[PDB]
Amino acid sequence: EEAEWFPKTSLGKLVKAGRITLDEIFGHSLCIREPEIIDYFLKATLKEEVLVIKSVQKQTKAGQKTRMKVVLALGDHNNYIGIGSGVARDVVSAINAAKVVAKCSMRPIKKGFWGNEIGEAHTVPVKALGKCGSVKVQVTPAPKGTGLVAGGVSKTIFKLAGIKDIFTSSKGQTCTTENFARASLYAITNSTNFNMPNVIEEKVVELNPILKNAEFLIEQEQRDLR
Amino acid sequence: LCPAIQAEFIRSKFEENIPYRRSVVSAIKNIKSAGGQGCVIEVSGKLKGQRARSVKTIDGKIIHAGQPKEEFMRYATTSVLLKQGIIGIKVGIMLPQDDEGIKGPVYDMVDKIKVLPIK
């Protein structure tokens, strides 16, 4: 038993029709607002890991009302990672909720070389910093074959993102698992967007694919109607 | 759809010394899967210590007020004896609508309005 997907959004129409690729999506900074879009391309490959489960409470006249809060990561060990939190009356329901958030916040992560460009890229390109609440994390590139010098939570995140060597430092109240997870994901993300000296010349330009395919979509408009 | 059966499934599991939570969750699944549009379960007594409490669970639709309660709602109550005292169990189930009148009422609730589609 399963339910077929009817795309709620305009971009959703293009993916189901098979007119687009996942790099084109990320490349044009298009919104993702249907989890099925990520399933379509990566369902066969996604792994996940639960970082924390915790119980939260609200005081009432009758007593404490209580809920389960779960935070997890989705990633593929190659290029993609996303982080998601959910709250529900039940630990199962909470996982279902968290997965939606994670999928709607996947990002591609760039890689580079510690020295010369021999072999395959293996570390973050550039030294960078990520901040969330009271927590700050800094990442530094590392020689090939050092492995992941990283703390408990952040180590899992680098692994899912497909990074092989790193050096890490940290400041603040790292016991707060949500802050430590978000800050480390920002650190790698910030490193990918650093304004490298080559970047200005590597630049390319194209028309947005939703404008490019307007003719087909106008046919689909009439097909749905007729 | 019989609350008197489900309550005895519950009473059994207490004597089998199984947690009330797991027992109740199973009961609600059985009631819903069999087609009941909702149900209520309450357990009361010396359930987790010397201080007595009651724990109540609600799922789907349940009617409390008026004549629609007498035709859609079914109830059962039982109790189990344990070394520390008596634990009481209440179960209520709301029957599905049924056009042949076997599983529940033929006519749906008096306050529901439905407007026909146009040709």
């Binding site: 020295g115 390109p125 550039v126 304004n195 000296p197 970047v199 | -």
Partner: protein, 128 residues
């Protein structure tokens, strides 16, 4: 009074953050000229004009899209050629790009030229 080489750096850093393309810098010294001329050689800034106002001096400069950050170090520490890589690893983001500038008997030079010429000096500033 503020240090002139510090003033230079904050003026361009803030204007870059505010997405301006050009600035006027209000107090200039001999090493400030040489610092700006270094950033031009490596293509971090594009155009330089100097105004001879008889009141100290001032400069007008065009910024490139390549400049992320620059800064001065105070005080100007003395370094042996053995020491410079320690400062390189502390200041710069990557082993692949960016410049650490050092004053020497051969003018201003970067951390690569130090190896070529076989000379330490005094640490001055950095940009990437």
């Amino acid at each position: 009074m503020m240090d002139k080489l510090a003033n230079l750096c904050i003026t361009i850093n803030n204007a870059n953050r505010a997405q301006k393309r050009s600035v006027v810098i209000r107090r200039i010294s001999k090493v400030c000229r040489l610092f700006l001329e270094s950033m031009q050689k490596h293509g971090y800034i594009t155009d330089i004009v100097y105004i001879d106002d008889h009141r100290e001096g001032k400069a007008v400069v065009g910024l490139s899209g390549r400049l992320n950050r620059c800064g001065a170090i105070c005080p100007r520490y003395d370094v042996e050629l053995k020491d410079v890589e320690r400062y390189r690893a502390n200041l710069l983001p990557s082993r692949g790009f960016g410049h650490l500038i050092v004053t020497s008997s051969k003018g201003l030079i970067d951390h690569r030229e130090c190896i070529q010429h076989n000379t330490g000096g005094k640490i001055l500033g950095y940009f990437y």
